[PDB]
Amino acid sequence: QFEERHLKFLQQLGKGNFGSVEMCRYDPLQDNTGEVVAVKKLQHSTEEHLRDFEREIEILKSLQHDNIVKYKGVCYSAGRRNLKLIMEYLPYGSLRDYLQKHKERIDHIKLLQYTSQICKGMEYLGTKRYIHRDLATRNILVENENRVKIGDFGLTKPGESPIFWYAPESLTESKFSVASDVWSFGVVLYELFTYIEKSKSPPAEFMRMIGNDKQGQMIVFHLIELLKNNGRLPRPDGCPDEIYMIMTECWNNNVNQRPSFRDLALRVDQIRDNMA
């Protein structure tokens, strides 16, 4: 399906300790044309890393939805002793970067369109019995101004910490579930309505609440205590009360009282209609 001979480098994208992503062109006709694809390869093919990568490939093979990253195939390099994953290329990259770079193209109607699409992708993942764990705007990708897709870059395996998206029972008991994905979705909705403004990100806000001085595990201890006793990210400037209410309801310490993704999609779509 994808012969290393015809996979031509175009551009270096992300890199981390676990994997790296490149833009490539697949040119089987050798005519300097072909489809542009995004290619992931492993930095170090240990037994565990290759097992993880193979599981990533099997997960992606099973997922087909308009708001989930689109799998294309695999390609073997180094005389078939290395493995690379081929995906559909999305020009605008992460939603976190798109929001910072293209504020001129974004208003509240647009934010709610993206919110709806994220909810629908999460509904789909639940039907596959898949728990995402890593929902955050850094892991949502932008195809164009009208279409976002959930992914999970996973190139590395306080400002950089994923803990600021995690539900309290994930922090205290390592319990990840659909309901903790709903908690993290609430943080995504917060991120959207901050426009990724500097100083207002979840890590920056939580660190201001706990004390910017704190380091190491002390951050975790204070974050758990804060969340367990109703400490929450504040309402973003300009964000409607009804949208903050959705965030608040996702951030319920009572796991079973969080809304479902089907509930959230219906609510967001009904609101979107009314502002449109």
Ligand SMILES: CCN1CCN(Cc2cc(NC(=O)c3ccc(C)c(-c4ccc5nc(NC(=O)C6CC6)cn5n4)c3)cc(C(F)(F)F)c2)CC1
């Ligand atoms: C604990 C670690 N676990 C391992 C297993 N994992 C499972 C998982 C793995 C993913 N893998 C991706 O999402 C992925 C993988 C590889 C690539 C190349 C891409 C990708 C695709 C399109 C694309 N367009 C661009 N454009 C740009 O960079 C523009 C210049 C800015 C970059 N890319 N990069 C996405 C998605 C899901 C999910 F969410 F779908 F269920 C789940 C989870 C973690």
